[PDB]
Amino acid sequence: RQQLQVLARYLKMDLDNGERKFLKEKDTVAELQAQLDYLNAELGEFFVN
Amino acid sequence: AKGSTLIVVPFNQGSKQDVEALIEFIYDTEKNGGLGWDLDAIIPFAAIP
Secondary structure, three states, rough: OOHHHHHHHOOOOOHHHHHHHHHHHHHHHHHHHHHHHHHHHOOHHHHOO | OHHHHHHHHOOOOHHHHHHHHHHHHHHOOOOOOOOOOOOOOOOOOOOOO
């Protein structure tokens, strides 16, 4: 693991970049799902469908 | 007047969630965070031009 981290540092490779983007996108999913849940609580399942 | 109480609440009559929440707040007991009131009159004069 230490050798891999050294090589990643040399290569300027961000091993955590994909994970960071994934958590940002998961937060975006949560916020869009919150909006959809609000619209569903508001109009109802029948209306939205 | 003596005995009169004014309860100013934020409210969107265009959202059924607020409609239900306001009626629940009016009718819930004071212990449960409500008013413990039973409405004698309803005057729904809210509108938008």
